[PDB]
Design a protein around this nucleic acid. Structure first.
Lengths: 175, 102, 104, 60, 239, 90
RNA sequence: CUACCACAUCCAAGGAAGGGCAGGCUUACCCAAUCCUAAUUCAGGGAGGUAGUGACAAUAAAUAACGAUACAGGGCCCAUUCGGGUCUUGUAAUUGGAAUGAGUACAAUGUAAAUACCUUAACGAGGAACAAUUGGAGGGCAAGUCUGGUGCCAG
């Protein structure tokens, strides 16, 4: 299949792993947290065979530079964190930190996680040029400063919504 | 300087398809130069689109994440044949290295 | 596998034990007898939750699965290993939920 | 079908209310921190016990 | 309306254009020079990297190296090179081939005057106010609030609130400029520099326009400015 | 209103052609509305209105911008029969 | 095409005739693109495209957010149990302004015709609306029924 569950899908710690992570980050179910953990497991296993080799080895030098360079492009790993084992140290909470649904809240603009999830899926808030409607987007470090409502959105610089105008039309009929 | 794309212009479907991969850029400017030179389009026939879109997008769901590829480190193609000691025609005598550092 | 290589059993209902039992949905009430088609031997079969005993009558070619009890019940008969799962080629719990109907 | 609720029809609404119910349980289990003082009040409000000793013992 | 370009981290402070359909824009606090192909929607990053602990090291083996915090004013001398004005006196000429600056210049309008000993004092002992000046540590540079280039020429004019308009002639190889001199006919906070040439092919009379203000364009941010006469500075140069 | 911008304009003498790609920049409205831009190049270029054929219309996802491709000749009397069958119905 | 040898079909019974595939234990729209071809910018070609027939398996969202009042005083955790902890929680309480698409449903692109098709328009959310489930556990209730008992109990 696409995503892989762990070998046993009920533990004492696992049942509140889904409870804590979904309740604070607005996750829908176990599916996408397991998907990111699937991606992080590929990254951390790729972090292994980088690091079982030595310094001035042709494998550790080239994509070892690249692997930290890719994550500083997406903003998961910090700029000064150019260590080859800090990619082992990062956990599943920092990918969920970089999620756009949680990024909409954390920049302001939302007042809650679920109101951000509503604002994401109601085709409201744009990333620079293009307006996106996915909760999990992996907003990069460079593109994070251009998270704003779309110009064709009522919270932005457009007309008000169809029920505020209808309420304005209904009180106009009362006048 | 590397001619990077804009912030919002990279993404493909607002969602499921990835942000952008550099291989996807390299194919895109090649086919649009083919558009801008030979002045004709090309269709979306299901014989090619069964592979040229589907497993391309299924790879792009799991390899390029956040605009950056990550599945290529988990691949197992060995990187020594294209490299060793920066090229071929390397060592038979002592003179081939003698005029290299000279 | 209980008898062959299969985990299920087509079988002809012969009669209905426990229809003369007094207490409703007791273990003696629920059990019926059924003959497996491949050998003709007669085996006993639980039918759960008495309303579906009211559904099975006579030549229904029922499907039989194992019981898999996790312990001795209040008054259960030990040894009875079979439960009716599908009557006339449709699931018995769906009849108890009256989703479908018994074809004749 | 037995009469279920609107809560089970959506997982995101269910995960929110399950977490907030679990958060209030966590405040009941241990005294978690909340804020500080943006106002005036000095001490506590639920009484001070004498023989309580909520400290773990450093047994050898 | 035609097209919108996106991508800076901080506010875009200045924009410069030419005949070709491309522009360069500069964000301040991210210290980015960003060249765009507007019909192509393609960006070109330019980072700095004036490492201070190595730039002081190469001076000691051969002078207060203020780190840049913003880049304010930008213009292109030609298609292949452009100049940038930072907020630490830095005037960087950037080749379009090189991500690094092909020519780095330190403080152009010098450092700011020292704060007054009795005005930072709060105390009656004069020698403690000399210890309240801290020497070279509290000294701050003059900042490039204006930097304009005549197109396809060798000279560009820099300006600040020193009351000085400094002209810099580049080399024929386009890798280094030197200071020609100072135009001090007006004193105050210059904001924008404009040029006009007129005449024949060789015999070219010049008219230079500079806008002297009492403070910065985007805010007040001013102190101890002397002789801040608002108006237009006119310089007329011949041949 | 809309604005067109011709790029890679190139004249062709043996078949009396000239072709150019065009970027059209919609402010918001709905679409290209291709009857407008053939009128737009009619008053920007000396176009002799029915001699133009715009077919390469690919809109980028998100609206407001479309890369258009078009071809125009001169002398509209022969331009009818130098055209293939699938666009004089336009 | 001719006799020869088999095998069918048609009759007024005198002769004219005659040449298995798909299926199990779909043979429809279409000459634009691309090439070949009658003559062949004109046309032709089972050369090529789209439709049902097909989840032999997998996949991303939505299926409400956001408040304002009034009400009450208990809620929750641990442990066999006496008990021990801990804190603004619970409203089948009213109520407000949002925002949106599920859908309806002009016209404009698209592509050869089309198809999908980007889209526009005008609407479209107050809850029995645009009313999703599946599985597991624990109970309680009758002037109700049955069995065993050492009243009034046990099942």
């Amino acid at each position: 299949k696409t995503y892989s569950t762990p070998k046993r899908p009920y533990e004492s710690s696992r049942l509140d792993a889904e409870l804590k992570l979904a309740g604070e980050f607005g996750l829908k179910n176990k599916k996408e947290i397991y998907r990111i953990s699937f991606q992080l497991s590929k990254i951390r296993r790729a972090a292994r065979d980088l690091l079982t080799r030595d310094e001035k080895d042709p494998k550790r030098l080239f994509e070892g530079n690249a692997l930290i360079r890719r994550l500083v492009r997406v903003g998961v790993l910090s700029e000064d964190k150019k260590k080859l084992d800090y990619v082992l140290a990062l956990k599943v909470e920092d990918f969920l930190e970089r999620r756009l649904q949680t990024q909409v809240y954390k920049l302001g603009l939302a007042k809650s996680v679920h109101h951000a999830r509503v604002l994401i899926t109601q085709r409201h808030i744009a990333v620079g040029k293009q307006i996106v409607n996915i909760p999990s987007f992996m907003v990069r470090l460079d593109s994070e400063k251009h998270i704003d409502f779309a110009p064709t959105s009522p919270f932005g610089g457009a007309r008000p919504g169809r029920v505020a105008r209808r309420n304005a039309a209904r009180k106009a009929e009362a006048s | 300087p590397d001619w990077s794309a804009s912030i919002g212009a990279d993404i493909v479907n607002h969602g499921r398809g990835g942000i952008k991969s550099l291989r996807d850029t390299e194919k895109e400017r090649r086919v649009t130069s083919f558009e801008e030179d030979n002045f004709t389009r090309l269709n979306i026939t299901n014989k090619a689109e069964k592979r040229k879109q589907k497993q391309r997008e299924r790879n792009a769901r799991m390899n390029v994440i956040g605009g950056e590829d990550f599945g290529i480190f988990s691949s197992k193609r060995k990187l020594e044949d294209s490299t060793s000691r920066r090229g071929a025609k390397k060592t038979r005598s002592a003179w081939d290295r003698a005029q290299r550092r000279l | 596998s209980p008898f062959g290589g299969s985990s299920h059993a087509k079988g002809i209902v012969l009669e209905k034990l426990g229809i003369e039992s007094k207490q409703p949905n007791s273990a003696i009430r629920k059990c019926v007898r059924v003959q497996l088609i491949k050998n003709g031997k007669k085996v006993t079969a639980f039918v759960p939750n008495d309303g579906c005993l009211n559904f099975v009558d006579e030549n229904d070619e029922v499907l039989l699965a194992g019981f898999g009890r996790k312990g001795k019940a209040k008054g259960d008969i030990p040894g009875v290993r079979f439960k009716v799962v599908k009557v006339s080629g449709v699931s018995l719990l769906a009849l108890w939920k009256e989703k479908k109907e018994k074809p004749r | 079908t037995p009469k279920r609720n609107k809560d089970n029809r959506n997982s995101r609404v269910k995960k929110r209310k399950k977490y907030q119910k679990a958060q209030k349980k966590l405040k009941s289990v241990r005294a978690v921190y909340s804020g500080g003082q943006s106002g005036v009040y000095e001490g506590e409000k639920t009484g001070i016990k004498k023989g309580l000793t909520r400290s773990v013992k450093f047994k050898n | 309306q035609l097209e919108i370009l996106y991508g800076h981290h901080d506010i875009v402070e200045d924009i410069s254009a030419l005949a070709m359909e491309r522009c360069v824009t500069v964000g301040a606090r991210d210290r980015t020079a960003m060249l765009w192909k507007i019909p192509d929607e393609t960006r070109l990053t330019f980072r700095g990297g004036d490492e201070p602990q190595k730039l002081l090291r190469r001076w000691m083996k051969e002078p207060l190296f203020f780190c840049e915090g913003s880049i304010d004013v930008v213009s292109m001398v030609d298609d292949f090179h452009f100049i940038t004005g930072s907020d630490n006196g830095n005037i960087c000429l950037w080749s379009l081939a090189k991500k690094k600056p092909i020519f780095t210049e330190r403080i152009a309008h010098g450092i700011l005057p020292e704060p007054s000993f009795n005005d930072i004092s709060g105390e009656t002992d004069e020698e403690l106010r000399k210890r309240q000046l801290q020497g070279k540590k509290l000294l701050q540079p003059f900042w490039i609030t204006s930097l304009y280039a005549i197109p396809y020429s060798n000279v560009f004019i820099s300006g600040s609130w020193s009351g000085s308009l400094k002209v810099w002639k580049i080399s024929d190889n386009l890798r280094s400029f030197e200071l020609l001199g100072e135009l001090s006919g007006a004193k105050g906070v210059v904001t924008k520099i404009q040029v006009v040439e007129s005449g024949k092919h060789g015999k070219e009379k010049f008219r230079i326009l500079a806008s002297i203000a009492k403070e910065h364009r985007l805010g007040r941010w001013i102190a101890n400015v002397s002789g801040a006469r608002n108006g237009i500075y006119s310089a007329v140069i011949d041949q | 209103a809309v604005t067109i911008r011709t790029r890679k304009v190139i004249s062709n003498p043996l078949l009396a052609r000239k072709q150019f790609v065009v970027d059209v920049l919609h402010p918001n409205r709905a679409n290209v509305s291709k009857d407008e831009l053939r009128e737009k190049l009619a008053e920007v270029y000396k176009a002799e209105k029915d001699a133009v054929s715009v077919f390469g219309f690919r809109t980028q996802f998100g609206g407001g911008k479309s890369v258009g491709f078009g071809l125009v000749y001169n002398s509209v009397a022969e331009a009818k029969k130098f055209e293939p069958t699938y666009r004089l119905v336009r």
